[model samples]
Target chain A: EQSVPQAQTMLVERHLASLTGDEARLLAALSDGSAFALLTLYSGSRFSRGEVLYRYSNAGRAAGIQCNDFIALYLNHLFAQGLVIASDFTESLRTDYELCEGDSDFRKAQAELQIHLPKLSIRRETLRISPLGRQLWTLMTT
Target chain B: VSIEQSVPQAQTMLVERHLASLTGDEARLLAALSDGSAFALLTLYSGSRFSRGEVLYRYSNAGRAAGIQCNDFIALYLNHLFAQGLVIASDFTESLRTDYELCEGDSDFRKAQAELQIHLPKLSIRRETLRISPLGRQLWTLMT
Candidate 1:
């Protein structure tokens, strides 16, 4: 008759014990990405949404992972888990790459102006890894 | 708290604790195994054990697709697993014996075989094969 905590401990031990060498490697890479993202934010590197995407994309590329969207999604999850905080976006930068509704791309008009400015929207918030995020990052990395 | 949530929370803590304890070599080996080719090998070998040559053959094909080399890495990876006690060598059971041979003039291969047999007295590398230990099997399942 195992107690609840005991049973949970046993299960977790089993799970950790079962991590393959390869899985550990994958986790390490992921942890590295998380820490890098968090540290850059913690160091006061505020970013527009596009900049955030670019950073994650750059990190992913350096890590030999080709999925920036996935990295962004993981960052979003971190935010949802309360490991990251967002401040009101204040930077002046290119608007969100996502196009607005009812926006027309008249190709001919853009060619003549030599300044192609598709309509853009300001990103609402900049994100920072919170203290809790820092803790989790430490746990993951070391 | 509900059991379901508590269970996952506990699991997360344990995973974090365990990961935090890994030494550098262990971490590096884990990363090598985390390669796509390595993952495929584990998945393929889960159901049945294969000889070194056989494992390498399949691994080579997989590595080719991933633009990586498999030979030295697989050897080092397996040795690391052996060092960690996650895999053990065995005398080739009759069925697998036919697929393998003590090739002529491969002193390096022969030396490795002899060394394994020497280490595991009951296991004959020349006459048998290597397989994941029970702990290794569990780990492989989690990995794949």
Candidate 2:
């Protein structure tokens, strides 16, 4: 079987190249088993935008990766690259954020999460990896 | 000293080498097996002998439910199982679309799966049925 090309034209590298040197460096740090750890954790379930950021941030902290400031950037990069897809957030998470009829906490959470979301309006979309993202993650690990 | 190349001896050495370096969540994850397909496979085997097709079915379905999109995790996990003589594939049958779909239709998945095919030491694939190797049964008994 032919190998997947890690080309500059590919979405993964293109987005990586777009990041500041420090951001790129921080992201690259994930290649050192950190990415694998996160993959192992998140492989278990879908997550809301807030939940995703919180969980990923916690894991990144455990791995000695300081990504809180740049996680939004990284996630946007992943989204731009089609590595992650969004789905409706779990009902429990929505309620936890006090999201009910005429509620605005969801918007506040979105901004706090720095979810510079795609054109789609945020309505508790759970995020997970795309097929291409999965392939990229595999490359990142091995 | 001459390197030993007996099948069982070599398999033992390889399995020990791989198991020795496991750390952190990788080790923990293996031990947890709680809701994982690894435990699921062992459960099926305990009830009755199964097939390679059955193994793939359970693994693929469970992985999807778990939100795991890539095939490499399963492939690597199976590599460990084969190395440890825990699970054994039965016979070579036609590959299924689910196998390909599990890879998210990526060529990289295909490439990686092929690579795994080259590396696993004692995997058996038959058209009929699958069984836990005696070594696998022992490990499962200890794990549960």
Candidate 3:
């Protein structure tokens, strides 16, 4: 059944479970230029997104990952599906890990999903979201 | 994306790229991490000195009340992390003597804890000396 509410979160988990380390790094990277890659030596808190991108640049380039190009593609998935927003990307964690309202340009966007039900010809309904940008998980519990 | 099949296709490429080679219990540990355990690892990822006691204590108090295997699995998980050059450990004796009981009582707890030890390699992890390897920082950098 096509659904929103919990369906999206569960799907997010499913999608996350399928992610690779490097692909996740891509997620992490874009999650940052995200606003965003992968590593380094550290012994403290308070990280710099620039530093992370630098390492991702090095390591991703080493494998010829072409992070920017790859990210450009990944961004569309996020952007269109309403998971990511571009800050310039123009780019761009925590255990407490507060969920942010999505920064989606679609903050004003609204639409309905359609579905076919067994015994019924067809159905459609629109989902409502607060104009405040909430990302994937926030709308589920909030 | 419109909830398209593309998500499946893209993930297909990632699944093949990332996890196709995993088979051992070691790989299970990798997939086994959650945002919970992942954050636990993330906290340590920054290079904090910790102990099995910390793993057990905080994990016990850790909300969702994950089974004691939280650390138990980490016993396996941590070692694999060690094996994969993610962390280094030393001063391992045997049987992490948790100040708190793993079962109903420390009596049975030690027995049960030691029981897990029978098949597990020597790295049951008691050393506070261990921390992320230099390589660990690299691996965790993105993997987290």
Give the top-scoring candidate (lDDT). 2
Count of clashing residue pairs in every prediction: 5, 11, 19
By lDDT, is 1 or 2 better?
Answer: 2
Please tell me the TM-score of chain B in candidate 3 relative to the true structure's chain B.
0.32
* Cα lDDT of model 2 by residue, B1-144, tens digit: 655754333223223433344433234434443322222221112111332212221132234433444534654554454444333333222444344244334454445434545544232322221233333333334334
List clashing residue pairs in candidate 1.
A21-B30, A22-B33, A22-B34, B91-B128, B92-B128
Please give the CA lDDT of all the candidate structures: 0.35, 0.36, 0.31
For model 1, residues A58-121, the per-residue Cα lDDT tens digits are 2334344443323332342344344556545433312321221112321222222122112212
TM-score of chain B of each: 0.38, 0.36, 0.32
Lowest summed lDDT window (length 10), candidate 1 chain B: B53-62
Off by over 4 Å in 1: A1-142, B1-68, B102-107, B111-126
Better model by lDDT: candidate 1 vs candidate 3:
1
Best by DockQ: 3
Q: What are the per-model DockQ values?
A: 0.01, 0.01, 0.03
* Cα lDDT tens digits for candidate 3, B1-144: 376544444445433433343334434444333221322221112222331212221111121243333444444444344433434332222343342223224243355445545544232322332333323333333445
Give residue A43's error in model 2 in angstroms. 30
